[PDB]
Amino acid sequence: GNFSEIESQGNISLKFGFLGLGMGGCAIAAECANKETQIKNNKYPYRAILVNTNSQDFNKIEIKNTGNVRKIQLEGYEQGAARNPQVGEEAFVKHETKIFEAVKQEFEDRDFIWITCGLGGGTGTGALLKAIEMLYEHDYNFGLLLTLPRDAEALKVLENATSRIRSIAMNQEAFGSIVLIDNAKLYRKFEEENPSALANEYTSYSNKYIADALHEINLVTSSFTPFSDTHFDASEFAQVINTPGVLSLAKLELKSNQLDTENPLGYLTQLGNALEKGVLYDTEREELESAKKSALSIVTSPLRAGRLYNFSFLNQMENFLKERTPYVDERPIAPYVNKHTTKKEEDIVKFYSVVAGLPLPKRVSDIIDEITRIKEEREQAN
Numbered sequence: 268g269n270f271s272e273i274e275s276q277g278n279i280s281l282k283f284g285f286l287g288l289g290m291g292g293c294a295i296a297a298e299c300a301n302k303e304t305q306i307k308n309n310k311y312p313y314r315a316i317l318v319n320t321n322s323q324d325f326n327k328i329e330i331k332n333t334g335n336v337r338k339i340q341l342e343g344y345e346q347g348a349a350r351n352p353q354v355g356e357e358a359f360v361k362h363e364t365k366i367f368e369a370v371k372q373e374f375e376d377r378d379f380i381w382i383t384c385g386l387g388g389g390t391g392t393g394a395l396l397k398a399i400e401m402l403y404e405h406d407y408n409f410g411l412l413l414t415l416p417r418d419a420e421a422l423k424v425l426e427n428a429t430s431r432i433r434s435i436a437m438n439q440e441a442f443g444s445i446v447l448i449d450n451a452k453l454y455r456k457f458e459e460e461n462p463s464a465l466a467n468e469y470t471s472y473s474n475k476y477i478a479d480a481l482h483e484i485n486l487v488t489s490s491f492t493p494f495s496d497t498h499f500d501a502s503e504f505a506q507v508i509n510t511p512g513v514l515s516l517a518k519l520e521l522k523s524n525q526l527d528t529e530n531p532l533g534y535l536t537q538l539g540n541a542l543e544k545g546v547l548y549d550t551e552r553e554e555l556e557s558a559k560k561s562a563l564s565i566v567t568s569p570l571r572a573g574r575l576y577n578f579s580f581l582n583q584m585e586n587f588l589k590e591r592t593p594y595v596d597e598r599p600i601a602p603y604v605n606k607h608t609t610k611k612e613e614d615i616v617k618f619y620s621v622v623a624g625l626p627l628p629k630r631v632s633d634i635i636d637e638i639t640r641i642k643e644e645r646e647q648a649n
């Protein structure tokens with residue numbers, strides 16, 4: 268996932284600000300913060316505030332960019348394995364001042380704010396609600412970068428995740444989009460992608476994967492030249508990110524030969540399958556049919572551009588997104604062109620879509636059953 272080439276003649280759309288909450292919540296934000304880029308004067312375009320109980324792992328987290336990040340610790344809350352949300356609630360409150368004071372300065376120019384939290388835990392999970400109130404009462408443009416625990420995480424944990432999802436989904440109107448991350452999915456992906464890899468490389472993989480996923484789209488929307496008036500530039504992007512509800516990012520890279528306008532069903536399926544198999548969490552057609560906003564950017568070389576971006580294509584795409592999200596306000600099928608392209612990736616046609624205003628995924632539903640299975644069986648034994 269190297270962007271050295273693009274970032275050079277490219278540029279970001281929004282200046283994100285990640286508010287870390289808990290071990291995992293800070294692991295991601297920190298990962299997003301420690302991102303060097305070839306952009307114009309700003310190796311580290313992202314800033315973050317790591318808010319978590321004083322632990323040995325948090326006291327371990329390494330930061331590359333000094334000054335763009337600030338660790339905030341909470342005394343007398345070395346919870347640990349306890350994993351009690353309410354506790355994490357008091358902690359954030361008892362230091363509410365010492366925190367916001369750091370948010371009022373570290374984010375004096377952040378177009379958006381990603382409340383990165385690891386659902387299921389106790390610290391982050393608990394403060395996740397008090398953190399939203401803070402950024403809300405102080406009029407900010409924030410979103411929710413949450414992660415869905417896996418089954419092996421045991422009962423208790425799952426109960427915590429579910430507890431907040433419900434609270435969130437019912438107050439989603441009070442803030443931006445919710446970039447849900449399915450740890451179960453990513454975990455199951457890392458096994459396929461790298462079958463030989465060891466379990467000690469997971470987190471790194473995911474964090475570095477979630478960071479690039481979020482960063483890649485932010486870079487694409489404002490690093491290429493449009494082929495027409497239909498745009499999905501920084502301005503439009505900012506919209507999809509401020510719309511309440513879950514957000515699903517999709518990506519698909521194909522070759523010019525593979526892509527056939529005469530026989531679209533061939534690749535359309537892939538795009539339709541790649542759109543269902545989100546980058547961070549799986550989503551079915553049913554859930555997409557209730558999306559408020561959509562967008563699909565196509566990036567390719569200057570030569571394959573004029574040839575590919577014909578009348579038929581543009582429509583075939585307009586129809587694709589159409590059947591996928593019939594109730595979307597507007598379907599900006601904005602095709603872009605990249606001049607500074609490598610002849611190696613010359614015959615490549617990349618896709619980038621962003622579906623917002625989506626309902627809760629099927630995963631959260633499963634996490635409700637896995638908790639039910641346990642509780643029920645725990646009594647079927649009595």
Ligand SMILES: Nc1nc2c(ncn2[C@@H]2O[C@H](COP(=O)(O)OP(=O)(O)O)[C@@H](O)[C@H]2O)c(=O)[nH]1
Nearest residue numbers: 289290291294385387388389390391416470473
């Ligand atoms: N993607 C990712 N998820 C994590 C990481 N650390 C923890 N998590 C997830 O977040 C959940 C809560 O763990 P953690 O954040 O350490 O608990 P907390 O510190 O009390 O908020 C776990 O069940 C994990 O699934 C991480 O580094 N990366």
